Amino acid sequence: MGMKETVSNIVTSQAEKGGVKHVYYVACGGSYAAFYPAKAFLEKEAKALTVGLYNSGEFINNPPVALGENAVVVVASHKGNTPETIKAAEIARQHGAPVIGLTWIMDSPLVAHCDYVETYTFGDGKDIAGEKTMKGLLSAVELLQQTEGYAHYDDFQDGVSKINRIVWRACEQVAERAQAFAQEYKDDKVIYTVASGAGYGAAYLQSICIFMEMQWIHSACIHSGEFFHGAFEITDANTPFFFQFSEGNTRAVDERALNFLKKYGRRIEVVDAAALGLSTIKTTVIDYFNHSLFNNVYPVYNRALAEAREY
Amino acid sequence: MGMKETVSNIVTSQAEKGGVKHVYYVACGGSYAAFYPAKAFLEKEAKALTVGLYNSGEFINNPPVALGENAVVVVASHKGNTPETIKAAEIARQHGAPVIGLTWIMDSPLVAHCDYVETYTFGDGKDIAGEKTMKGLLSAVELLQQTEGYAHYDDFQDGVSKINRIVWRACEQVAERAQAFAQEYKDDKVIYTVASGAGYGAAYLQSICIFMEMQWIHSACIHSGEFFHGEITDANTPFFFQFSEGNTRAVDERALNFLKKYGRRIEVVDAAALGLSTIKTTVIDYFNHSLFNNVYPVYNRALAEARQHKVEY
Numbered sequence: 243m244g245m246k247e248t249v250s251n252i253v254t255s256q257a258e259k260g261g262v263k264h265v266y267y268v269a270c271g272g273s274y275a276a277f278y279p280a281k282a283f284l285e286k287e288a289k290a291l292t293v294g295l296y297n298s299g300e301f302i303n304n305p306p307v308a309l310g311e312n313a314v315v316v317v318a319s320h321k322g323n324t325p326e327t328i329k330a331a332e333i334a335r336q337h338g339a340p341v342i343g344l345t346w347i348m349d350s351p352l353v354a355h356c357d358y359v360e361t362y363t364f365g366d367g368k369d370i371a372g373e374k375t376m377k378g379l380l381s382a383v384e385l386l387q388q389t390e391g392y393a394h395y396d397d398f399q400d401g402v403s404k405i406n407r408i409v410w411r412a413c414e415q416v417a418e419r420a421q422a423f424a425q426e427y428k429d430d431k432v433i434y435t436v437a438s439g440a441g442y443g444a445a446y447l448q449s450i451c452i453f454m455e456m457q458w459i460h461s462a463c464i465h466s467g468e469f470f471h472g473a474f475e476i477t478d479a480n481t482p483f484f485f486q487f488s489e490g491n492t493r494a495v496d497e498r499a500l501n502f503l504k505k506y507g508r509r510i511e512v513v514d515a516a517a518l519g520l521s522t523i524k525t526t527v528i529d530y531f532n533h534s535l536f537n538n539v540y541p542v543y544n545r546a547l548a549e550a551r552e553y
Numbered sequence: 554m555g556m557k558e559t560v561s562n563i564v565t566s567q568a569e570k571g572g573v574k575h576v577y578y579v580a581c582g583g584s585y586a587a588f589y590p591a592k593a594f595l596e597k598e599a600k601a602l603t604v605g606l607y608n609s610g611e612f613i614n615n616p617p618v619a620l621g622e623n624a625v626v627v628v629a630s631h632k633g634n635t636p637e638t639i640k641a642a643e644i645a646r647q648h649g650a651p652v653i654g655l656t657w658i659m660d661s662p663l664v665a666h667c668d669y670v671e672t673y674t675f676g677d678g679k680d681i682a683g684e685k686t687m688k689g690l691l692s693a694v695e696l697l698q699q700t701e702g703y704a705h706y707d708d709f710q711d712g713v714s715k716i717n718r719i720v721w722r723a724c725e726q727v728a729e730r731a732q733a734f735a736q737e738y739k740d741d742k743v744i745y746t747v748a749s750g751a752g753y754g755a756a757y758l759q760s761i762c763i764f765m766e767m768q769w770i771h772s773a774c775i776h777s778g779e780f781f782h783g784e785i786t787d788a789n790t791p792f793f794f795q796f797s798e799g800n801t802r803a804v805d806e807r808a809l810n811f812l813k814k815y816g817r818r819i820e821v822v823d824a825a826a827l828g829l830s831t832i833k834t835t836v837i838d839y840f841n842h843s844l845f846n847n848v849y850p851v852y853n854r855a856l857a858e859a860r861q862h863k864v865e866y
Contacts, residue, residue, distance in 0.1 A: 263600075271782030285605050289574075289619045292603045294596050299778030299807070300749060304800035304838070308600045326778070432770050438611055449773075450783050457786050459743055460773040462760075467610030471582035471635070471865050472761060475771050491615035498610070529615070552782045 322350020633661020752841025
């Protein structure tokens with residue numbers, strides 16, 4: 243309802259100016275990675291909207307020439323006080339781009355620099371359907387639906403209705419495996435992550451979480467499609483792989499990579515979205531729900547690992 | 554003039570279909586990183602072209618709905634044999650998108666699935682104005698100029714006319730420093746790289762070069778803007794720092810100041826110190842990649858030598 247209405251307000255306001263033609267997602271840290279699904283969505287699905295995903299520091303120092311009245315800028319900062327992101331919202335407003343801000347803190351400094359503010363669920367036992375990543379995706383879904391039309395809108399809303407129950411089931415499902423993982427890798431100071439597709443940002447965040455636990459070296463988050471092109475970590479006989487096995491249209495890319503790692507006898511912890519019940523969401527939209535699945539299941543593993551030893 | 558007649562041919566053929574509206578750069582390995590400047594160029598400069606940079610495997614398994622007669626696909630494979638990339642050209646042609654192929658081998662399997670084939674300079678002694686990265690960039694520059702117009706076209710071409718000289722002079726300039734670097738880091742198992750902006754792909758490729766030399770861990774290629782938002786550990790890892798010229802120099806300078814303040818071990822390669830600044834500030838961002846990608850081998854050779862002694866280009 244909320245994001246739908248916000249986008250309707252924007253489509254109405256910008257109509258006389260030639261409408262919305264460009265979407266920018268601008269954030270730092272976890273908030274940047276959490277916008278990756280929205281970027282993947284508009285790249286896959288749009289024919290008449292551009293999409294850009296920027297780090298806030300890059301955006302404010304090097305804004306695109308298309309920033310103006312035919313752009314919408316979506317910013318995110320959990321506490322609403324990330325300075326570069328506040329400056330991004332400000333520069334957007336000065337160029338006449340409507341700004342949607344995503345934040346947990348509704349009286350934070352960010353909110354003064356946004357045209358529209360949306361919040362999200364957060365913390366233990368949140369409703370996933372309303373989490374930050376989902377609100378970012380809904381901005382994209384609505385902007386597409388309300389400008390060009392989106393053929394899989396109903397399928398998408400069906401996915402939104404399902405993701406919470408899928409995630410809480412999945413967290414229960416993995417409890418046992420998480421304990422064994424913790425035992426197997428509690429002494430591994432470096433672990434690579436592997437992923438592809440619209441959920442890649444969740445794997446990147448997991449590579450950060452591993453670094454934070456192990457406090458040694460921040461290692462590559464490898465794209466599945468790079469095995470034996472640019473990704474020669476497979477020649478690394480020491481370092482294990484934490485493998486995000488997606489559901490949807492890049493699953494075959496992941497499967498090829500996983501088969502390679504298996505053929506080399508590497509140590510792999512596989513987290514499989516298909517094994518965890520994501521496939522009740524329709525094939526037309528499931529790519530976009532990988533992030534929400536993995537980003538909310540990995541804490542089970544990370545907590546177990548910790549015990550064995552900017553959002 | 555790399556790409557100009559090819560792009561003219563495409564802009565002519567597609568006009569009746571509604572024109573070129575979408576550009577896709579599709580590759581694996583080195584060739585993917587080499588297209589990052591073209592992606593950054595169209596993101597900054599275009600108002601009516603979309604740009605997408607894809608890994609070939611992702612592209613063939615999950616092609617965008619805009620892949621059709623209003624798209625152009627630029628694929629690259631050095632030897633012209635990369636199966637996923639060949640398949641990407643094939644799927645593009647099935648959807649009616651013109652395909653430009655970049656390869657060094659002009660009778661390779663790739664060529665049979667491209668509408669247009671372009672090559673590039675390669676090997677020691679290469680002319681940077683013609684190198685693969687520069688061909689990628691000129692595809693973007695020419696696609697922009699011939700569809701919407703590009704305000705800084707002449708400045709860009711002036712940069713092209715300067716970059717070979719800049720690069721080869723810089724390689725000589727850093728020779729002594731590369732020897733000292735090699736002695737200082739010959740026993741370092743892991744080295745982070747740091748960069749931002751249109752030259753980020755060169756830093757990413759350098760992270761692979763370091764991993765291949767040291768054969769320990771492939772460490773993060775850290776974006777300069779993400780040090781304030783994602784830590785110094787006991788490992789005391791050193792940094793190979795790419796200090797750009799142009800619009801993200803201020804982002805890099807913030808990170809550099811932080812590393813300096815905590816007394817980290819840093820090897821700085823600074824585009825302004827290496828002569829890049831004769832290129833106009835309107836276009837200089839786009840020449841960082843070509844500079845660093847061609848200067849780092851000086852450091853990497855020296856490191857290999859100091860230690861006694863696969864990747865798709």
